[PDB]
Design an enzyme around this catalytic site. Structure first.
Site, PDB file in Angstrom:
ATOM      1  N   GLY A   1      74.992 -59.404 -78.410  1.00  0.00           N
ATOM      2  CA  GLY A   1      73.614 -58.919 -78.279  1.00  0.00           C
ATOM      3  C   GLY A   1      72.918 -58.857 -79.634  1.00  0.00           C
TER       4      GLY A   1
ATOM      5  N   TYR B   1      66.752 -51.759 -80.869  1.00  0.00           N
ATOM      6  CA  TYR B   1      67.345 -50.735 -81.724  1.00  0.00           C
ATOM      7  C   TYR B   1      68.560 -51.247 -82.494  1.00  0.00           C
ATOM      8  N   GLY B   2      69.065 -52.436 -82.144  1.00  0.00           N
ATOM      9  CA  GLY B   2      70.168 -53.055 -82.903  1.00  0.00           C
ATOM     10  C   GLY B   2      70.627 -54.444 -82.488  1.00  0.00           C
ATOM     11  CB  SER B   3      72.053 -57.318 -83.644  1.00  0.00           C
ATOM     12  OG  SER B   3      72.803 -57.187 -84.842  1.00  0.00           O
ATOM     13  CB  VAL B   4      75.898 -55.706 -79.747  1.00  0.00           C
ATOM     14  CG1 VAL B   4      77.301 -55.251 -79.342  1.00  0.00           C
ATOM     15  CG2 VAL B   4      74.908 -54.580 -79.499  1.00  0.00           C
TER      16      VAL B   4
ATOM     17  CE  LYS C   1      72.165 -50.988 -80.608  1.00  0.00           C
ATOM     18  NZ  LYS C   1      71.624 -50.222 -79.439  1.00  0.00           N
TER      19      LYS C   1
ATOM     20  CG  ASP D   1      69.320 -45.180 -71.991  1.00  0.00           C
ATOM     21  OD1 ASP D   1      68.989 -46.381 -72.076  1.00  0.00           O
ATOM     22  OD2 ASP D   1      68.506 -44.303 -71.650  1.00  0.00           O
TER      23      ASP D   1
HETATM   24  C1  LIG Z   1      79.249 -56.473 -74.478  1.00  0.00           C
HETATM   25  N1  LIG Z   1      78.205 -55.561 -74.973  1.00  0.00           N
HETATM   26  C2  LIG Z   1      78.556 -54.310 -75.282  1.00  0.00           C
HETATM   27  O1  LIG Z   1      79.699 -53.873 -75.187  1.00  0.00           O
HETATM   28  C3  LIG Z   1      77.414 -53.412 -75.789  1.00  0.00           C
HETATM   29  C4  LIG Z   1      77.681 -52.137 -76.287  1.00  0.00           C
HETATM   30  C5  LIG Z   1      76.618 -51.355 -76.713  1.00  0.00           C
HETATM   31  O2  LIG Z   1      76.908 -50.149 -77.199  1.00  0.00           O
HETATM   32  C6  LIG Z   1      76.075 -49.064 -77.029  1.00  0.00           C
HETATM   33  C7  LIG Z   1      75.831 -48.276 -78.141  1.00  0.00           C
HETATM   34  C8  LIG Z   1      75.048 -47.135 -78.030  1.00  0.00           C
HETATM   35  C9  LIG Z   1      74.498 -46.769 -76.791  1.00  0.00           C
HETATM   36  N2  LIG Z   1      73.736 -45.665 -76.710  1.00  0.00           N
HETATM   37  C10 LIG Z   1      73.612 -44.841 -75.650  1.00  0.00           C
HETATM   38  O3  LIG Z   1      74.237 -45.031 -74.592  1.00  0.00           O
HETATM   39  N3  LIG Z   1      72.785 -43.790 -75.833  1.00  0.00           N
HETATM   40  C11 LIG Z   1      72.505 -42.834 -74.897  1.00  0.00           C
HETATM   41  C12 LIG Z   1      71.236 -42.253 -74.889  1.00  0.00           C
HETATM   42  C13 LIG Z   1      70.906 -41.270 -73.964  1.00  0.00           C
HETATM   43  C14 LIG Z   1      71.878 -40.871 -73.018  1.00  0.00           C
HETATM   44 CL1  LIG Z   1      71.494 -39.669 -71.862  1.00  0.00          CL
HETATM   45  C15 LIG Z   1      73.154 -41.422 -73.007  1.00  0.00           C
HETATM   46  C16 LIG Z   1      74.229 -40.957 -71.984  1.00  0.00           C
HETATM   47  F1  LIG Z   1      74.505 -39.658 -72.099  1.00  0.00           F
HETATM   48  F2  LIG Z   1      73.953 -41.220 -70.722  1.00  0.00           F
HETATM   49  F3  LIG Z   1      75.309 -41.631 -72.231  1.00  0.00           F
HETATM   50  C17 LIG Z   1      73.465 -42.399 -73.967  1.00  0.00           C
HETATM   51  C18 LIG Z   1      74.747 -47.572 -75.681  1.00  0.00           C
HETATM   52  C19 LIG Z   1      75.558 -48.708 -75.775  1.00  0.00           C
HETATM   53  C20 LIG Z   1      75.318 -51.838 -76.686  1.00  0.00           C
HETATM   54  C21 LIG Z   1      75.108 -53.126 -76.184  1.00  0.00           C
HETATM   55  N4  LIG Z   1      76.139 -53.848 -75.756  1.00  0.00           N
END
Ligand SMILES: CNC(=O)c1cc(Oc2ccc(NC(=O)Nc3ccc(Cl)c(C(F)(F)F)c3)cc2)ccn1
Ligand SMILES: CCCCCCCCO[C@@H]1O[C@H](CO)[C@@H](O)[C@H](O)[C@H]1O
Length: 331
Positions: free
Chosen positions: A27, A28-31, A46, A161
């Site tokens: 993939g 606010y960022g790149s993954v 990320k 999220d």
């Molecule tokens: C194969 N691709 C990937 O593995 C992958 C991994 C990523 O990692 C991530 C990194 C950070 C997040 N940030 C949250 O989730 N923030 C969050 C905000 C509010 C609320 Cl309420 C919540 C909660 F509580 F519900 F969890 C969580 C999500 C995913 C991103 C993209 N792609």
């Protein structure tokens, strides 16, 4: 302090500890996906995008980091690691978050198919259990939907999220000033319905079509709900509608477990004050084979008024720095 290695990835230089092997963009960022040698897990790293370019970015970076650091539950995303190549506050510019590699969401696993009732008990049970924990932290997700649900091929599920309106509560689409936690319970109903039937419950073409489809199922507002409408125009427009009775769910979801139908009824009430809570739903007979009142944990809540402040960029930056330095990895 770990040994870092540099590598060009996603149009920038990534700089990461050597435990994170063979970075591979996904993939606010790149993954990037990567292999964590310390734990033996596949992980998502990320690199946050422009975290301290503006007050808004810095503030959002702090809220994200703090939220993630506090989420410690099997059914919610967790932070495996957070690092910076920086050695001092003065050189602090980038933030990388590390989580489990989340290669499939609820859609990738379900594929528009009807699920077995046992299978839906397990998935929905896990959503509500994560949601009890999130709600106990005084957090409302507000955008719960299949794509915000990480699910592995064992159907083990985490709420996250990543940052369609089909799963949104009616009050969120009518920009209601104040929401309760049961906005997320609405979303769970929508998801649950779809898992049982193979079809989106409310696939609106736009905003108004969405509400129309909602009111067709749950009826127009009754007198009790009309009394709670602050807006004189919203009140007077609802009075313009031709009354609809709420459909009997027993005949909308024919052949479904009668208990699944009953839970759906308690989830998808127009009046959010009348919707079942996450904790209440976990005690519902429908989850009898999964429910354990001694293993549905709650969060310690923390101070989310610190996130809602009006601070300078360098203030946010230094606060996010302390959050990076103070991070203790999970068990
Ligand atoms: C194969 N691709 C990937 O593995 C992958 C991994 C990523 O990692 C991530 C990194 C950070 C997040 N940030 C949250 O989730 N923030 C969050 C905000 C509010 C609320 Cl309420 C919540 C909660 F509580 F519900 F969890 C969580 C999500 C995913 C991103 C993209 N792609
Ligand atoms: C015409 C469509 C009407 C949609 C009405 C949605 C009712 C939402 O439910 C309402 O939730 C509010 C918002 O959190 C609460 O303050 C109210 O007490 C509750 O009745």
């Amino acid at each position: 302090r770990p040994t870092f290695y540099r590598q060009e990835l996603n149009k920038t230089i990534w700089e990461v500890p050597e435990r994170y092997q063979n970075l591979s963009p996904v993939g606010y960022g790149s993954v990037c996906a990567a292999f964590d040698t310390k734990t033996g897990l596949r992980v998502a790293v990320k690199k946050l995008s422009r975290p301290f370019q503006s007050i808004i970015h810095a503030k959002r970076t702090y809220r994200e980091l703090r939220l993630l650091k506090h989420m410690k539950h099997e059914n919610v995303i967790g932070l495996l690691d957070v690092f910076t190549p920086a050695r001092s506050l003065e050189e602090f510019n980038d933030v990388y978050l590390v989580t489990h590699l989340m290669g499939a969401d609820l859609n990738n696993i379900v594929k528009s198919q009807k699920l077995t009732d046992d299978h839906v008990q397990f998935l929905i049970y896990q959503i509500l259990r994560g949601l009890k924990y999130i709600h106990s932290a005084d957090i409302i997700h507000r955008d719960l939907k299949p794509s915000n649900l990480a699910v592995n091929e064992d159907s083990e599920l985490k709420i996250l999220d990543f940052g369609t309106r089909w799963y949104r509560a009616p009050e969120i689409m009518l920009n209601w000033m104040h929401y309760n936690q049961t906005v997320d319970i609405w979303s769970v109903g929508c998801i649950m319905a779809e898992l049982l039937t193979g079809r989106t419950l409310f696939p609106g073409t736009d905003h108004i079509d969405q509400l129309k489809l909602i009111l067709r199922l749950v009826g127009t507002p009754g007198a009790e709900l009309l009394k709670k409408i602050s807006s004189e125009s919203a009140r007077n427009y609802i009075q313009s509608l031709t009354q609809m009775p709420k459909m009997n769910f027993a005949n909308v979801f024919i052949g479904a477990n009668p208990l699944a139908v009953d839970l759906l009824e308690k989830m998808l009430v127009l009046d959010s004050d009348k919707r079942i809570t996450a904790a209440q739903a976990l005690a519902h007979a429908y989850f009898a084979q999964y429910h354990d009142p001694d293993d549905e944990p709650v969060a310690d809540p923390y101070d989310q008024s610190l996130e809602s402040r009006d601070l300078l960029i360098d203030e946010w930056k230094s606060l996010t720095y302390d959050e990076v330095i103070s991070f203790v990895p999970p068990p």
